[PDB]
Design a protein that fits this description.
Keywords: Influenza, polymerase, viral transcription, RNA, viral protein
PDB class: viral protein
Number of domains of chain C: 3
Helix content of chain A: 25-40%
Shape of chain A: globular
Oligomer: heterotrimer
Chain A: RNA-directed RNA polymerase catalytic subunit
Radius of gyration of chain A: 31 Å
Shape of chain C: elongated
Structural class of chain C: alpha+beta
Bound molecules: the ligand O=c1ccn([C@@H]2O[C@H](COP(=O)(O)NP(=O)(O)OP(=O)(O)O)[C@@H](O)[C@H]2O)c(=O)[nH]1, the ligand O=C(O)c1cn(CC2(n3ccc4cccnc43)CCCC2)cc(O)c1=O, magnesium ion
Largest sheet of chain A: 5 strands, mixed
Helix content of chain C: 40-55%
Assembly: hexameric
Largest interface: A-C, 202 and 187 residues
Entry title: Bat Influenza A polymerase elongation complex with incoming UTP analogue (core + endonuclease only)
Strand content of chain C: 15-25%
Chains: A alpha+beta (743), B alpha+beta (250), C alpha+beta (701)
Number of domains of chain A: 4
Number of helices of chain C: 23
Strand content of chain A: 5-15%
Distance between the termini of chain A: 92 Å
Distance between the termini of chain C: 99 Å
Structural class of chain A: alpha+beta
Chain lengths: 743, 250, 701
RNA sequence: AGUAGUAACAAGAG
RNA sequence: UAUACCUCUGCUUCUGCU
RNA sequence: AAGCAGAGG
């Protein structure tokens, strides 16, 4: 007998055993090496779906820009980016007519949130393309470098602390013809490694001042650096992601804030709801569309995706949508929300790290960057890269590729959701006035579309009408990834429906394990993961007990904290055995201290220190929860040396961090981080709430610290807590500090 | 007193780079310059903890552990070593030092864990004196409602409770706003009288008051009652085909 | 204006007024009368505050003392609110609703100071109407000379008030002589514009029938819908349509599997062909040390002979593999210690890939090289499905006589649902712990854990890692099993996809000549002879050693260490199939499922037809499926699963009488068959889907 | 050689 | 020259180490 | 309030 697991679907429905179709126990596919080929594929597919447009040379950057808007109508079912702006404006006008007061309320909330947003909101991002260093940095580092270069060049509106003044500085910096930035250059020396007697290259990173031109600064300000997405499930081929710089992210934040305020009040939107709220919204839409019918009414659901969603959106369509939604608003608000589609219409894509080249007669390999890829003869590339470069060459501008159509991966999620929700909103039966109508839900490119009609020909006419109306606005439905059946079963962002949403436990399977923080946080993380999967993802109680057992196994093997009566030998066996022997009540010892596991089903919501607190020895609980804990951080006592008492146990320690680059001296650029940390630590002594809540203020740190020191000295003098000579010495120290900052 | 911090500011203002930073960075821009990093970032901490616990010193703690924890064990294990910089504020620690502190460190008669995490002890007291009924098997109709996972206070909302916490713990940095309610003033007076001469760090005090006062809500599938004492045991009382009859303590 | 204000006032007053206008958003080079008024208010507050001290007694001495007034005006607003909050928290006063100008420590009063060009009584009543409800002291000054305090009660001395009145009178007369006094009494919006470079950028971000950004903005602001969608749909071709093709699984074809050579074994260890040297109840001098347990297992086999190459690795040097095994056995026979690092010989350097990378140099030094060619990115060669992987999956779903998974202790069961879960978990453990896939889990977890620890601790050493598992019998006795050895290469792993090479040498009793296409990557030697005692007879079978060079990465070792999640993927599904029954019968259906072998679930395909099994067989089959998903993880499997899930849902929607339809089934078949290249598990899953489709077609007749 | 798959690792910037 | 954006869920309050 | 982790698009 040959064993076939897929024959379990003869007896069980597919949705009731859908977790067997997710092979999520193995490693996900990763990308090896560069992502330059995927970036070139993205640019070639973006210029191929828009190829019947107008080519214009930009007068500011010199980039070849392709305009497919109001081009020829599509003649086939291939993906097209020829969105008609009049149909887009008609759909947004119908969306405003179906929801009176929606756009005005969303614009009013966006105006209220523009006046309150600060610059450090831009530190919410992750890896940001830094135009000063021509590489990716964290968002706070790239923002601090941008602000330092703007203040060194004379753009100091961002000293007010508001985001909109930083955006004014961004738009005013384009008038500078010579931007003086600080880069990171590299010195190399051939030393000898003593561990292997081998000659290596020792790299020393320093700082260097360089002058950018006007066009080079404008190309760097419109640059999206492109990587490749790693650990992506469900795909065979890889694709490229993109990150913008700091000159784009504030405007993109404001546009996405407005589009989020629009999407929060639309019933046919899948954003920004998620989890159980999105499932309840889908179930309510399906119940309203399945109940509101007659005796002879047919209802069909399309589970629908879209082919190349980010490639076929257009920033000019987003500009028209922004200018139509903000109708009647003040013109500064319209211009501020119009900047980001204008910046994305003139965007460029950094091709990445280039490619690796190999010489076999010399037996060497070398990484040639993208900026040096244009000066290589075509016979040195392989066939696919040669075809890519021959298609790419006319779009090259200073190491980057011009990309005027497209929006790239996930840059305008909510605005594209608004564009899809308008096509969903068109199919109201009191407006369409036909034999068919449609409802449903849209989330980015995923859609569940319910067409109701009287015959199957009416359903076919409704599907054709929705498909052609989506084709009018640059939305290309994937004909090989979408399907249609009767209403009662569909799929929406890997949520499977069969008269109610079924569970998919395998998707939450990588969350079961050891998180890797310390011994205290990981136990609570594991127990709460098991509890949350019992609540939400239909994890059965026997499998939950098995998950508790496997987590205790993984936790004891990860931190080497096996029980005191075990025979395994690690580096921690003797001390844990010593703690096990001299403990009377061994049930009160933690699992990290070699104690037994106390968790069953009923107590997963209770932490381990509290659950074992009544079973501990007083000596063990006095050592474990000692307020003189040397493993954690102790805050210094404020002016109201001596430190505060620690609450957390000794298992809340800090793991050792390693930030070293191989054969690289980084001490020339690691200095200012330490000086920033010293300045923040000396600020926290005067303002003890700065770690709990973000402090605000336009004055400098030194002025705030001196004013706080003076007022605290005066209050402590006027309360019997400090002497008069101490007050005089504090005020004389503040006066000498004020004298030091002027001479 | 307040003279040591201003003399440390005097020592730091003599350095020209520190003076330029303290005179050109605002309080708003300190949130930007605080998260400033320069080297490479450590990704995938789970795998890093998998291989790093096999090494000799995976823990980094302060220098005061050289005065609280000895260098050697009774078995001969090295508990801490210094780094490659003479006079740093950080040394490299072995987990045998954690085990030595848990088996032979200084015993403290006072602990702050039952006071700071009093909500979890309330949960344990609610579970221990609970009553379990029989398990009944039938198809559960779970409605994904929005229920409270933290009840908070009966008279406060979330923002009012956060303003009460900011008034109690950090009264000199509340800014321009004032407590515009009577329940805010009464709870502020009571929590200020309860927290006098408290040697707990103020951030831990603020998070204890945040667990006590701020109401939290989540979207959960509910088959039975929606009270917050039943939301905390939602994994225990209901599933997909069964229902555990349970009455909490109190 | 601006020049008079700089010619009169001190630089402290000008700096305070400039910082106040920078805080509120103005400039002295534009607004001049407001700058002069802010400077005048600042100088009046400074004259009110200066030369007023409090000595050690407490009375106001006018000249080492302390100031009588705290200046709140001129500070930044958060600094000023910090000062006001600290003052209100020192005393017992209520917080003022606005920021006042001074604080008097002697009178303990907040002071609001106003300098007006109008009349004193009118401005005083206006500021009292603005500041009503609190005890803020109000004092109003004017350029005429008159004043009005709070209820005509003064707290300042007459000399200081006379100096303030004299200064305001002199400033008023100098404004009269300067000709700027007429503009002062008469004076008693968010903006965002485009700079011209960004304006020229805005003019090029439009639809191509527009030349200016403001023209397009006026077009969008004045747009009315007049049937543009209906006209554009009447103008568009009829070829652009979403025609629904009806889905019928009786009419669809099967998946087209690729052709070529047969698929090859690519696991990191042997599976059905693995032999283990075992010690029963170990109690030697290092029961727990891996190399000592390996030597204790090697000292149970006495049939060693001279190793001969009986199956060559066709792409490699097989004498190097022979010398590697000779060096490994000789170094084990003379090993002293708890670990073993092999000497870096030439054959071991060949087998571990030492020096195979080209030397990485910078492009600035490699410009004159006349033969720099790009790395080739060729697609993988297609392979035909062979029948060994079905035999592997058949053997992996079988019960063994050994318990391979030990589970940790739980808490005590108090709730009745905990007792129900304990009974169901005991049934799951009785059906799943004696499985061959559980042994594969333990082998993979041990190999990946030891390889990761050795790769991160001994990066330059050629460490020997034995393949050791530990199991219990059906009576409860311990048994330590050795499957072979792993020689780790150099492991300077920086990227997550960086490959550490190793050499795996696994014991076997399987002749590779009977299925040589399974072993393209292996070099199989004949190392021994074992007396195999069978039931009918007793023969002497040769013991082979399968030797191959393999490689792994840190993410692959990370996911190999977490293969026990496979136990979570199977037993969550089976329990759901229990619970979906338990909601129907209104009782716990665990014991009717496990204690009544009625053979209910289809899992097999015989020549007689479709075979059914019990629920524990389903447990073992789903466990083996999760284990083989974890072992043979690739991008082909991910793409094939994600693209064949849609066809499974289409077949299910047909069986639910929901009338399924597609829009491009040919493109769906192309997307499925694109992901079927050379992995044997993906080929086996494609054949499994074809068998399921044929069974669905035979079910509908 | 091997890992592997549209480009890399097979040490010398992660 | 190197882990993007958006949303949801969960945990912690971290003082930075070649 | 922020950071980290997981999932989805
Ligand atoms: O990891 C992700 C996944 C999806 N997305 C965003 O979600 C959009 C749709 O998500 P998608 O998965 O459907 N990708 P798509 O571009 O439509 O190509 P395909 O369906 O294969 O023909 C994409 O175009 C991205 O904009 C991301 O930004 N990051
Ligand atoms: O800011 C205050 O508290 C304050 C402000 N005025 C209004 C004017 N003024 C003076 C400084 C200042 C700063 C910002 C806005 N208006 C400001 C007075 C002259 C022109 C306007 C008057 C007082 O008497 C005050 O006490
Ligand atoms: Mg799509
Ligand atoms: Mg999608
Ligand atoms: Mg004032
Ligand atoms: Mg005033
Ligand atoms: Mg090769």
């Amino acid at each position: 007998m040959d064993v076939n697991p897929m024959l379990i679907f003869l007896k069980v429905p597919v949705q009731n055993a859908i977790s067997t179709t997710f092979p999520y126990t193995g490693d996900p596919p990763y990308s090896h090496g560069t992502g330059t080929g995927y970036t070139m594929d993205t640019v070639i597919r973006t210029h191929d779906y828009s190829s019947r447009g107008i080519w214009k040379t930009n007068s500011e950057t010199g980039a070849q820009q392709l305009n497919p808007i109001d081009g020829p109508l599509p003649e086939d079912n291939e993906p097209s980016g020829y969105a008609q702006t009049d149909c887009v404006l008609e759909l947004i006008e119908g969306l405003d007519r179906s929801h009176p007061g929606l756009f005005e309320t969303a614009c009013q909330e966006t105006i209220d949130a523009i006046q309150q947003t600060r610059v450090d909101k831009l530190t919410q991002g992750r890896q940001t393309y830094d135009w000063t260093l021509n590489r990716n940095q964290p968002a706070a580092t790239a923002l601090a470098n941008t602000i330092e270069v703007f203040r060194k060049n004379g753009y100091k509106l961002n000293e007010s602390g508001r985001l909109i003044d930083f955006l004014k500085d961004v738009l005013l910096s384009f008038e500078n013809d010579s931007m003086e930035v600080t880069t990171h250059f590299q010195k190399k020396k051939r030393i000898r490694d003593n561990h292997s007697k081998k000659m290596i290259t020792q790299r020393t990173i320093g700082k260097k001042r360089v002058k950018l031109t006007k066009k080079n600064y404008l190309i760097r300000a419109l640059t999206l650096n492109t990587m490749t997405k790693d650990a992506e499930r469900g795909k065979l081929k890889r694709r490229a992601i993109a990150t913008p710089g700091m000159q784009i992210r504030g405007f993109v934040y404001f546009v996405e804030l407005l589009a989020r305020n629009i999407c929060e009040r639309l019933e046919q939107s899948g954003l920004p709801v998620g989890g159980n709220e999105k499932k309840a919204k889908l179930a309510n839409v399906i119940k309203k569309m399945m109940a509101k019918s007659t005796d002879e009414e047919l209802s069909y659901t399309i589970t629908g995706d879209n082919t190349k969603w980010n490639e076929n959106q257009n920033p000019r369509i987003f500009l028209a949508m922004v200018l139509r939604i903000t109708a009647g608003q003040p013109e500064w608000f319209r211009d501020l929300l119009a900047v980001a589609p204008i910046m994305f219409s003139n965007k460029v894509a950094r091709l990445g790290r280039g490619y690796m080249f190999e010489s076999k007669s010399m037996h060497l390999r070398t990484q040639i960057s993208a900026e040096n890829l244009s000066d290589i003869n075509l016979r040195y590339f392989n066939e696919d890269t040669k075809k890519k470069i021959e298609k790419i060459r006319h779009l090259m501008v200073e190491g980057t590729a011009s990309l005027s159509p497209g929006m790239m991966m996930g840059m305008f999620n909510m605005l594209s959701t608004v564009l899809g929700v308008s096509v969903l909103n068109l199919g109201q039966r009191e407006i369409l006035k036909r034999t068919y109508w449609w409802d449903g839900l849209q989330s980015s490119d995923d859609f569940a579309l319910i067409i109701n009609g009287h015959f199957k020909e009416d359903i076919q006419q409704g599907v054709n009408h929705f498909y052609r109306t989506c084709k009018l606005v640059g939305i290309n439905m994937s004909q090989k990834k979408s399907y249609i059946n009767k209403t009662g079963t569909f799929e929406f962002t890997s949520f499977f429906y069969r008269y109610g949403f079924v569970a998919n436990f395998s998707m939450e399977l990588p969350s079961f394990g050891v998180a890797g923080n310390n011994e205290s946080a990981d136990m609570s993380i594991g127990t709460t993961v098991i509890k949350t999967n019992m609540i939400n993802n239909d994890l059965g109680p026997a499998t939950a007990q098995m998950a508790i057992q496997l987590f205790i196994k993984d936790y004891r093997y990860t931190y080497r904290c096996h029980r005191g009566d075990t025979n395994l030998e690690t580096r921690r066996t003797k001390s844990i055995k010593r703690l096990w022997t001299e403990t009377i009540s061994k049930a009160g010892l933690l699992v990290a201290d070699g104690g037994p596991n106390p968790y069953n089903l009923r107590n997963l919501h209770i932490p381990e220190v509290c659950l074992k607190w009544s079973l501990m020895d007083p000596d063990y609980r006095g050592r474990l929860c000692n307020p003189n804990n040397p493993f954690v951080h102790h805050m210094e006592v404020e002016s109201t040396s001596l430190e505060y008492d620690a609450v957390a146990t000794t298992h809340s320690w800090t793991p050792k961090r390693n930030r070293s680059i191989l054969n690289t001296n980084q001490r020339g650029i690691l200095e200012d981080e330490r000086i920033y940390q010293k300045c923040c630590q000396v600020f926290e002594k005067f303002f003890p709430s700065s770690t709990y809540r973000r402090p605000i203020g336009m004055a400098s740190m030194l002025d705030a610290m001196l004013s706080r020191a003076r007022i605290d000295a005066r209050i402590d003098l006027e309360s019997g807590r400090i002497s008069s000579q101490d007050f005089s010495e504090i005020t004389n120290t503040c006066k000498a500090i004020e004298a030091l900052k002027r001479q | 007193s307040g003279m040591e911090r201003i003399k440390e500011l005097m020592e730091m203002v003599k350095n020209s780079r520190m003076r330029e930073i303290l005179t050109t960075t605002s309080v708003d821009h300190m949130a930007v310059i605080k998260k400033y990093t320069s080297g490479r970032q450590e990704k995938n901490p789970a795998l890093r903890m998998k291989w790093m616990m096999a090494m000799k010193y995976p823990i980094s703690a302060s220098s005061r552990i050289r005065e609280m924890i000895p260098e050697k064990d009774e078995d001969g294990n090295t508990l801490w070593t210094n780094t490659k910089d003479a006079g740093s504020n950080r040394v490299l620690v072995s987990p045998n030092a954690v085990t030595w502190w848990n088996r032979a460190g200084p015993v403290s008669d006072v602990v702050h864990y039952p006071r700071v995490y009093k909500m979890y002890f309330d949960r344990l007291e609610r579970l221990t004196h609970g009553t379990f009924g029989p398990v009944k098997f039938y198809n559960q109709v779970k409605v994904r409602k929005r229920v409270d996972i933290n009840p908070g206070h009966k008279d406060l909302t979330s923002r009012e409770a956060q303003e009460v916490i900011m008034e109690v713990v950090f009264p000199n940095e509340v800014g321009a706003r004032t407590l515009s309610s009577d329940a805010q003033l009464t709870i502020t007076k009571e929590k200020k009288e309860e927290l006098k001469n408290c040697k707990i760090s103020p951030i831990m005090v603020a998070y204890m008051l945040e667990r006590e006062l701020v109401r939290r809500t989540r979207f959960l599938p509910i088959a039975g009652a929606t009270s917050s004492t039943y939301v905390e045991v939602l994994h225990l009382t209901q599933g997909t085909c069964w229902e555990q009859q349970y009455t909490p303590g109190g | 204006m601006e020049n008079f204000v700089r010619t009169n006032f001190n630089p402290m007053i000008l700096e305070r007024a400039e910082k106040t206008m920078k805080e509120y958003g103005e400039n002295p080079q534009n607004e001049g009368n407001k700058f002069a008024a802010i400077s005048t208010h600042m100088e009046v507050c400074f004259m009110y505050s200066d030369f007023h001290f409090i000595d050690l007694e407490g009375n106001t001495i006018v000249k080492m003392l302390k100031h009588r007034f705290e200046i709140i005006e001129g500070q930044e607003r958060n600094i000023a609110w910090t000062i006001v909050n600290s003052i209100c928290n020192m005393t017992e006063n209520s917080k003022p609703r606005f920021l006042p100008d001074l604080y008097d420590y002697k009178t303990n009063k907040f002071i609001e100071i106003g300098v007006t060009r109008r009349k004193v009584e009118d401005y005083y009543y206006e500021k009292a109407s603005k500041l009503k409800g609190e005890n803020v002291y109000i004092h109003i000054f004017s350029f005429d000379g008159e004043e009005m305090a709070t209820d005509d009660e003064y707290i300042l001395d007459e000399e200081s008030r006379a100096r303030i009145k004299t200064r305001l009178f002199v400033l008023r007369q100098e404004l009269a002589t300067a000709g700027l006094w007429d503009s002062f009494r008469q004076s008693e919006e968010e903006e965002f514009s485009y700079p011209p470079t960004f304006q020229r950028l805005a003019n090029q971000s439009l639809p191509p029938s527009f030349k200016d950004y403001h023209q397009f903005k006026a077009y969008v602001s004045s747009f009315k819908a007049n049937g543009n969608i209906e006209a554009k749909l009447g103008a568009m071709s009829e070829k652009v349509n979403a025609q629904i093709e009806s889905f019928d699984p009786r009419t669809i074809r099967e998946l087209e599997l690729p052709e070529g050579k047969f698929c090859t074994q690519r696991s990191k260890f042997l599976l059905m062909d693995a032999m283990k040297l075992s010690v029963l109840n170990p109690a030697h001098e290092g029961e727990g040390i891996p190399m000592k347990d390996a030597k204790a297992c090697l000292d149970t086999f006495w049939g060693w002979k001279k190793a001969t190459i009986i199956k060559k690795h066709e792409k490699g040097v097989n004498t190097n593999y022979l010398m590697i095994w000779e060096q490994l056995l000789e170094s084990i026979k003379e090993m002293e210690g708890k670990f073993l690092n092999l000497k870096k010989t030439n054959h071991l350097k060949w087998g571990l890939g030492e020096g195979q990378a080209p030397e990485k140099m910078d492009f600035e030094d490699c410009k004159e090289v006349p033969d720099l060619f790009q790395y080739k990115s060729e697609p993988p060669e297609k392979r035909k499905l062979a029948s060994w992987i079905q035999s592997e999956f058949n053997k992996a779903s079988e019960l063994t006589n050994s318990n391979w998974i030990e589970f940790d202790e739980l808490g005590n069961d108090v709730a009745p649902i905990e007792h129900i879960a304990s009974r169901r978990r005991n049934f799951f453990t009785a059906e799943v712990s004696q499985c061959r896939a559980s042994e594969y889990i333990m082998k993979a977890v041990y190999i990946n854990t030891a390889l990761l620890n050795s790769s991160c601790t001994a990066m330059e050493e050629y460490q020997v890692i034995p393949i050791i598992t530990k199991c219990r019998d059906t009576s409860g006795q311990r048994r330590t099993n050795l499957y072979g050895f792993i020689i780790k290469g150099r492991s300077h792993l920086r990227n997550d996809t960086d490959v550490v090479n190793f050499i795996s040498l696994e014991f076997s009793l399987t002749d590779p000549r009977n299925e040589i296409h399974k072993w393209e990557k292996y070099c199989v030697l004949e190392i021994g002879d074992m007396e195999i005692r069978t039931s009918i007879s007793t023969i002497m079978k040769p013991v082979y050693l399968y030797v191959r060079t393999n490689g792994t990465s840190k993410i692959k070792m990370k996911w190999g260490m977490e293969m026990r999640r496979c136990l979570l993927q199977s037993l969550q599904q089976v329990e759901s199939m229990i619970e979906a029954e338990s909601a129907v019968k209104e009782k716990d259906m665990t014991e009717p499922f496990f204690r009544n072998r009625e053979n209910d679930w289809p899992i097999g395909e015989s020549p007689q037809g479709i075979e059914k099994g019990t629920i524990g067989k389903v447990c073992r089959v789903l466990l083996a499926k999760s284990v083989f998903n974890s072992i043979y993880a690739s991008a082909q499997l991910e793409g094939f699963s994600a693209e064949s899930r849609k066809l499974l849902l289409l077949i299910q929607a047909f069986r639910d009488n929901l009338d399924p339809g597609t829009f491009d089934l040919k493109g769906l078949y192309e997307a499925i068959e694109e992901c079927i290249i050379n992995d044997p598990w993906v080929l086996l899953n494609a054949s499994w889907f074809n068998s399921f489709l044929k069974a669905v077609q035979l079910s509908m007749g």
